[PDB]
């Protein structure tokens, strides 16, 4: 059971004088020969993808910062200095910019893999909490970063996603001014964002430290509602070399596609308007902040008192909870409820591979995510308003009511024993 196999430091004198600093003991006993089940599909790779992508982003950023100059008058020029003069330039920038896209794409699949195979269910709450914390940090990071080029979309995205904090009453304008460094956006905001943007990744790495510490102490989830049967465990092959090699193969494929993009379709995920300098006096059409924030942008700009299911007219009971504040609360709740999940699913069961109704609702949820992604880009004119309202309502409904009802009446399936599934 949970064989650590510390190696007893019996190799030789080198492995015996290393009794001063244990380090190799840690690596070997724990982070390399960690028994993992055999039943792992191709959905348990994306964590390696995320770690590598994080390293990539940190490196490329440390390189760019050697040529980026945070200032309204010299940011655009420095970015062009990069893409033209520097030796590698375009590569670093395109790899930095697009890799953010892959990062978020990979976390999406990392998260939805989790929702299916009960990875939030006990005893794996801490991992979930830490993951939501990370998600928040990395969203804030990417936001701070999209601003640095001082293009045109930078300015206005910052403007609105800071007016949010100002929507709330009493302490809105104060926070807004304390965050922007002033009444509106200017170089001060740029300096804050650069610093902050150059600091959070390390916090993320530490949090990834705790993320990795947790699921090593707590066994990796597995396609089944079963554990490694610790009591000797013919199942649960080790990590190295088997799963290391599997993950590296998938990672090679992913990097292949990523570099093909970088080299042929690099400006595809971007907004052309970010290639024109900023004008605080003129706003372009369809700001469309980005593609990894459209869901929440839509959940925000949906509630506007423009439907018979408009709960804003009812929330107006209290004269303080206006629309804006309502949408902001709705977004914060869209995330808080995803974090609260493990204490809402009242099921003494596990992976939805043995819960059909859950399968249907979950695929509807994935569809809802895609729809929200597609709607945040389209105007607030009919019919898109009804669509956004329906989708947000279903998100909240799933995460609040649907899981309890299932946990109550959702066991028409024969659960599998013997995690050694030699089929």
């Amino acid at each position: 059971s949970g064989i650590p196999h510390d190696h007893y430091e019996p190799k030789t004198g080198i492995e015996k004088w290393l009794h001063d600093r244990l380090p190799i003991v840690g690596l070997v006993y724990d982070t390399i020969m960690i028994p993992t089940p055999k039943n792992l599909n191709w959905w348990w790779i994306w964590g390696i993808v995320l770690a590598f992508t994080l390293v990539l982003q940190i490196v490329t950023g440390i390189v760019l910062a050697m040529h980026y100059t945070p200032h309204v008058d010299l940011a655009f020029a420095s970015v062009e200095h990069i893409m033209r003069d520097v030796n590698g330039g375009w590569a670093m920038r395109y790899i930095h910019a697009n890799g953010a896209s892959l990062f978020f794409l990979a976390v999406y699949i990392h998260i939805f893999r989790g929702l299916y195979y009960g990875s939030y269910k006990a005893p794996r709450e801490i991992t979930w909490i830490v993951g939501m914390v990370i998600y928040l940090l990395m969203m804030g990071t990417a936001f701070m970063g999209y601003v640095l080029p001082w293009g045109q979309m930078s300015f206005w995205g910052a403007t609105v996603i800071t007016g949010l904090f100002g929507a709330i009453p009493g302490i809105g304008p104060s926070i807004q001014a304390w965050l922007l460094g002033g009444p509106a956006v200017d170089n001060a905001t740029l300096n804050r964002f650069f610093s902050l943007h150059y600091l959070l990744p390390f916090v993320i790495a530490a949090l990834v430290a705790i993320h990795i510490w947790a699921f090593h102490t707590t066994g990796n989830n597995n396609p089944t509602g079963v554990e490694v049967r610790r009591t000797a465990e013919k199942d649960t092959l080790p990590f190295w070399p088997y799963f290391v090699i599997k993950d590296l193969f998938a990672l090679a494929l992913v990097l292949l596609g990523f570099f093909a993009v970088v080299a042929y379709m690099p400006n595809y995920l971007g907004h052309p308007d970010n290639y024109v300098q900023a004008n605080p006096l003129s706003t372009p059409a369809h700001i469309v902040p980005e593609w990894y924030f459209l869901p929440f942008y839509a959940i925000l700009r949906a509630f506007a008192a423009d439907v018979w299911v408009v709960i804003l007219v009812d929330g107006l009971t209290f004269g303080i909870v206006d629309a804006k504040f309502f949408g902001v609360i709705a977004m914060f709740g869209a995330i808080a409820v995803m974090a609260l999940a493990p204490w809402l699913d009242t099921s003494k069961v596990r992976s939805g591979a043995y819960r059909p109704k859950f399968r249907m609702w979950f695929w509807f949820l994935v569809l809802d995510f895609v729809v929200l992604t597609w709607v945040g880009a389209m105007p607030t004119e009919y019919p898109y308003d009804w669509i956004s309202l329906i989708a947000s309502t279903y998100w909240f409904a799933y995460f609040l009511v649907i899981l309890p009802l299932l946990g109550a009446t959702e066991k028409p399936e024969p659960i599998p024993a013997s995690i050694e599934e030699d089929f």
Binding site: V160, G181, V185, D186, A188, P280, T283
Partner: protein, 181 residues
Amino acid sequence: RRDFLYHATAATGVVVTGAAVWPLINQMNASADVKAMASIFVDVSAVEVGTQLTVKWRGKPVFIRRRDEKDIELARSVPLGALRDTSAENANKPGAEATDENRTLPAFDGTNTGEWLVMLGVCTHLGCVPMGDKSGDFGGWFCPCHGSHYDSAGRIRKGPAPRNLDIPVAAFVDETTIKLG
């Protein structure tokens, strides 16, 4: 005493810690170079009355637009009913009703109001710049960030934007100038 001494040491440590932390949170507030926040003299100087005039100030645009009769009559023909924000955000006067007589502007040092209107070109939803030059579904301004329709006098309509376009404190400089601040 055990309890008193221990707890008092802890309290003093906490107090010193807070006194050291506060400035790390104070430096991010508005510096003195941002404290200035003073006024600007914009000269109308034959702007070809009726199209528009925009000027930068405080980091935001200040819209100075003359009036077109059709725009005016549409304005003056708006009863307070069915008007989202009836407060006349203009800070040059009290919270008087959002009426065109009070909402247009001072009278050149003379006596007339239905000819000029200078407001802050900042959408009250989240601070975007609406497009002017007769746009939207009300013959006024249209915000492209989320779709908020403004009217001729700038009062909000048809969108999430809660209130109309504010009006800063401004007076005239004897028939060719504007004082913003």
